[PDB]
Amino acid sequence: KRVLYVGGLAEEVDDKVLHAAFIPFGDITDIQIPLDYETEKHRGFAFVEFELAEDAAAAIDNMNESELFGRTIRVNLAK
Amino acid sequence: EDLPYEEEIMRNQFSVKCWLRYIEFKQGAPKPRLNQLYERALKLLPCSYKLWYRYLKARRAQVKHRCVTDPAYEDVNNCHERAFVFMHKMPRLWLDYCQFLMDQGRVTHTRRTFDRALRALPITQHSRIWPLYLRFLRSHPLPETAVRGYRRFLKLSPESAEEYIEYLKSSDRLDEAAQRLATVVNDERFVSKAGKSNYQLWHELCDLISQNPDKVQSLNVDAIIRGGLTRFTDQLGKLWCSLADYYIRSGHFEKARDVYEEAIRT
Amino acid sequence: PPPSYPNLKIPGLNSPIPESCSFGYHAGGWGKPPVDETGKPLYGDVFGTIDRTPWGELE
Amino acid sequence: VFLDPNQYQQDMTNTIQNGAEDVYETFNIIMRRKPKENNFKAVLETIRNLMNTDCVVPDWLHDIILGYGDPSSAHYSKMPNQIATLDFNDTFLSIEHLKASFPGHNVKVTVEDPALQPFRITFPVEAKTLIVEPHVIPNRGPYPYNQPKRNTIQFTHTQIEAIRAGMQPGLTMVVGPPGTGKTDVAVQIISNIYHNFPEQRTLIVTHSNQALNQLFEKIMALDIDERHLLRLGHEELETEKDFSRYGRVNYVLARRIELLEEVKRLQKSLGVPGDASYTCETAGYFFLYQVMSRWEEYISKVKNPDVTEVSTFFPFHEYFANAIFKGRSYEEDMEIAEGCFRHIKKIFTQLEEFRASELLRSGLDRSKYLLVKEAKIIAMTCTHAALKRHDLVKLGFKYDNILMEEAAQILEIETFIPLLLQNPQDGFSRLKRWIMIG
Amino acid sequence: ATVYVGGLDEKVSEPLLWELFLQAGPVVNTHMPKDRVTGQHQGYGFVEFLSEEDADYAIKIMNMIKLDVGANIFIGNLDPEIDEKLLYDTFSAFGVILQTPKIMRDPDTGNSKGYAFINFASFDASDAAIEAMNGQYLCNRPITVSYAFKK
């Protein structure tokens, strides 16, 4: 319950932006972003694994329906 | 076990687990050991932020007899050692130190530290500094309107806007209460007024409460009675409020007959 | 637990953390392991502090 | 199209009461005009608004504008908030020029050494003596090219009095004959105001684009950072640099790229591992983590003292290897290290100021952020100001000093319209100085 | 000893009821002697734990276990960490629920901001429930309930 899925990411949203935007809730363990090798861009979604499940739950509470790159994203438990 | 602890840390200085075990094993910790572990972890690797913050909180809990003079400086120094670590523990310790140590003089430094953490702007720290600012303004309401403006001009929040409006309405007569009343009766969108209420009459009620005896600049009758006369949609509610506003606004030598003629028409 | 039965300990409430449990007060944790004001738990420990081969057997 | 609500109301009332025909149903022709000659409605709307607000002008300026009272109530000598000691560093080129700029003043220097005569002038308030203090501008790094330029125009005593009146609070009127150096005195006053007050904002008002181009060309020769200057207009470029919003946005982006590259190079020279490219926020974090910490440690080491250890403890030798210490005296090495740290702090401050360019993706938002906070001197015309005064007041543009040229070519309403380009400050007008040259 | 199994769930079988009775203490009787017609659970049952304090603490524990003239009550400071059936059972201790608790959650995400409204059986039912839970202990954010507004 430390890994959460975050979708609706603007094309400019990157791993550094995700680390900066999720770091406030607690240390992050990993960031995985599916990309399409033919285009070199992401598919609009990613998975962030935070160190703490409580920090992931707080980040889910505070980030779901939030604004990032001008657009609303989705945050939830990944599995 | 101090000598074998050093014998492990001589080859395993980069391992902080041995350092935490050595700190736990000696149950007299901060005679040489708090400073030694701090020096070793601060000269060895720029990591172990959570363990360093936990150790700083533990030392603050241990040296809290003389509440905070040297422990406060130690926690502040360890917090400044965090270069760009915008976590949820270093701002928390900074707020705790500003609550225990000297405040509202050094709390400007704590606010600057929160802003430095919020230069990269993840929305976790301002949502904790603005409530902390409102709770710290419980003895002097000088920066409360400023934090309210920094939150309302940097965050769209209806519940926080209503709390700040009640905060400025907790003033003498119209000290920023008129500004919040005008910003709440403006109603450009439809999400802010619908935050903690949905009646389409609270804005008229606030305009009538502004039309009450106060010490605003003028705010006499114009917008409030204008709106209450065009889109009243409430029987004897806007009419009586408008009659009273023309009754006692300032002297009302001619506005009294104004209210009388208004009652004669409607 | 039980006033005159009690011989049951609850896991995470009177027993220790089940494998990899989580302390916290939201939905999904273990909360405050019930303890006295002096630190001793409600009971037990809510926090937590040969060759059996048969001789004749078929292949 | 939007129709006049008052005129539409009059037409509807006439049709309803007097049986008139529908005026809105008889239009058969629509006429357009030149946009440069079709600003009458905008000026009239600015007039109606500035007549509907409280018109909070300076308390020493209301009576003056009204045409009555003491005409000298706005001078610098009659202002109670007059500054005693003022830094005119780059105004005077030499001590003889400084003394000769005040024939009726006796100059008393705080140092006797003729090799010791940047000058600050303190005025009394017997009483015709000016206290002149020479100063040394702080070192700005190991780069000799980074030394700030200085104005070379040998101002006369009248120009010196005009610049002094401009540097002092109040209303300052400059009557300049053709070729009297009006642009020179204006540029000197603006530079002195920016240098003595870095927390203030200067609004430059011109009548045409030529005066603005000349003022920008004159400023370009002085020690003015281009990141704080802004040019408004709704035109053919006349300057060697782009002072418009878009030119400033491109320059801010290019300087931010250069600052990120320099921060990466400094990190590599300090031995911090990591191939990640840095942004403004990460640049500030890395600064406050490594550079501020190392500077504090070196300062506790050498400022709490040998000439050799001052360089042995320098944490930016590899960072300054492309450019430090002389080993002559302790003071000199300390000043050189302080200058290197000042250059690094300038890099960090420029990065922190430019981070807004990553905070706002649109160019218009970047221009608004630069005009509202980042810029310290914003220039424009009287017409552009009269057209966009509402936009300025709504966005929150603020200013402390106002400098206007060609005021003898601006209409009265076109001179009053610049004085209300922002809201009052807690019941008082924020304007501190009003200089008009013409 | 005798405990009222209130909001007694229909299909929540007396077998697992008695297994929870044991997993709490003296499982001596689990009974919901139902309607002589239906067979399903009759909303209140008798659970005997042959020790009084056993039944007392077992009750404190197995409470909140997740088993139109305006009879709708507004319930805010709401616990977002609940499920539908459990919330309905908790609300139904003082009456039926003619509409399960509709939680006024934001639609951008799917996580609530802390309010709801619930159609109970009676207005006196909403009264009693909102009274016993006025400010009282909700899951994480304490409850605050009363008669509901109309939209």
From Swiss-Prot, chain A:
Residues annotated as transmembrane: none
Residue ranges annotated for the RRM domain, each copy included: 2-79
Keyword list, A-Z: Isomerase, mRNA processing, mRNA splicing, Nucleus, Phosphoprotein, RNA-binding, Rotamase, Spliceosome
Record's GO cellular component terms: catalytic step 2 spliceosome; cytoplasm; cytosol; extracellular region; ficolin-1-rich granule lumen; intracellular membrane-bounded organelle; nuclear speck; nucleoplasm
Mutagenesis or variant effect for residue 43 to A: No effect on interaction with KMT2A
GO molecular function terms noted in the UniProt entry: cyclosporin A binding; mRNA binding; peptidyl-prolyl cis-trans isomerase activity; poly(A) binding; RNA binding
Distribution of this protein across tissues and organs: Found in all the examined tissues including heart, brain, placenta, lung, liver, skeletal muscle, kidney and pancreas.
Domain comment as written in the entry: The RRM domain mediates both interaction with RNA and with KMT2A (via the third PHD-type zinc-finger), but has much higher affinity for the KMT2A PHD-type zinc-finger.
Subunit structure: Identified in the spliceosome C complex. Component of the XAB2 complex, a multimeric protein complex composed of XAB2, PRPF19, AQR, ZNF830, ISY1, and PPIE. Identified in a pentameric intron-binding (IB) complex composed of AQR, XAB2, ISY1, ZNF830 and PPIE that is incorporated into the spliceosome as a preassembled complex. The IB complex does not contain PRPF19. Interacts (via RNA-binding domain) with KMT2A (via the third PHD-type zinc-finger).
Family stated for the protein in its record: Belongs to the cyclophilin-type PPIase family. PPIase E subfamily.
Organism, scientific name: Homo sapiens
Curated annotation (Swiss-Prot), chain B:
Domain of life: Eukaryota
Residue windows of the HAT repeats: 1-28, 29-61, 71-103, 105-139, 141-173, 179-211, 216-249
Protein location: Nucleus
Subunit structure as annotated in this protein's UniProt entry: Associates with RNA polymerase II, the TCR-specific proteins CKN1/CSA and ERCC6/CSB, and XPA. Identified in the spliceosome C complex. Component of the XAB2 complex, a multimeric protein complex composed of XAB2, PRPF19, AQR, ZNF830, ISY1, and PPIE. Identified in a pentameric intron-binding (IB) complex composed of AQR, XAB2, ISY1, ZNF830 and PPIE that is incorporated into the spliceosome as a preassembled complex. The IB complex does not contain PRPF19.
Role noted for this protein: Involved in pre-mRNA splicing as component of the spliceosome. Involved in transcription-coupled repair (TCR), transcription and pre-mRNA splicing.
Family membership: Belongs to the crooked-neck family.
Protein name, as recorded: Pre-mRNA-splicing factor SYF1
Record organism: Homo sapiens
Lineage: Eukaryota, Metazoa, Chordata, Craniata, Vertebrata
Gene: XAB2
Included stretch of the parent chain: 20 to 285 of 855
Curated annotation (Swiss-Prot), chain D:
UniProt subcellular location: Nucleus; Nucleus, Nucleoplasm
Binding site for ATP: 154, 159, 179-184
Residues annotated with N6-acetyllysine modification: 394
Superkingdom of origin: Eukaryota
Signal peptide coordinates: none
Chain's role: Involved in pre-mRNA splicing as component of the spliceosome. Intron-binding spliceosomal protein required to link pre-mRNA splicing and snoRNP (small nucleolar ribonucleoprotein) biogenesis. Plays a key role in position-dependent assembly of intron-encoded box C/D small snoRNP, splicing being required for snoRNP assembly. May act by helping the folding of the snoRNA sequence. Binds to intron of pre-mRNAs in a sequence-independent manner, contacting the region between snoRNA and the branchpoint of introns (40 nucleotides upstream of the branchpoint) during the late stages of splicing.
Family stated for the protein in its record: Belongs to the CWF11 family.
Assembly notes: Identified in the spliceosome C complex. Component of the XAB2 complex, a multimeric protein complex composed of XAB2, PRPF19, AQR, ZNF830, ISY1, and PPIE. Identified in a pentameric intron-binding (IB) complex composed of AQR, XAB2, ISY1, ZNF830 and PPIE that is incorporated into the spliceosome as a preassembled complex. The IB complex does not contain PRPF19. Within the spliceosome, interacts with SNRPA1, SF3B1, SF3B3, SF3A1 and SF3A2.
Listed name of the protein: RNA helicase aquarius
Residues shown, of full length: 627 to 1095 of 1485
UniProtKB/Swiss-Prot annotation, chain E:
Domain (RRM): residue spans on this chain: 1-67, 71-150
Phosphotyrosine modified-residue sites: 44
Coiled coil regions, renumbered to chain: none
Protein location: Nucleus
Quaternary structure and partners: Component of the 17S U2 SnRNP complex, a ribonucleoprotein complex that contains small nuclear RNA (snRNA) U2 and a number of specific proteins. Part of the SF3B subcomplex of the 17S U2 SnRNP complex. SF3B associates with the splicing subcomplex SF3A and a 12S RNA unit to form the U2 small nuclear ribonucleoproteins complex (U2 snRNP). SF3B4 has been found in complex spliceosome 'B' and 'C' as well. Component of the minor (U12-type spliceosome) spliceosome. Found in a complex with PRMT9, SF3B2 and SF3B4.
Disease: Acrofacial dysostosis 1, Nager type: A form of acrofacial dysostosis, a group of disorders which are characterized by malformation of the craniofacial skeleton and the limbs. The major facial features of AFD1 include downslanted palpebral fissures, midface retrusion, and micrognathia, the latter of which often requires the placement of a tracheostomy in early childhood. Limb defects typically involve the anterior (radial) elements of the upper limbs and manifest as small or absent thumbs, triphalangeal thumbs, radial hyoplasia or aplasia, and radioulnar synostosis.
Family of this protein: Belongs to the SF3B4 family.
Protein name: Splicing factor 3B subunit 4
Gene: SF3B4
Shown residues in whole-protein numbering: 13 to 180 of 424
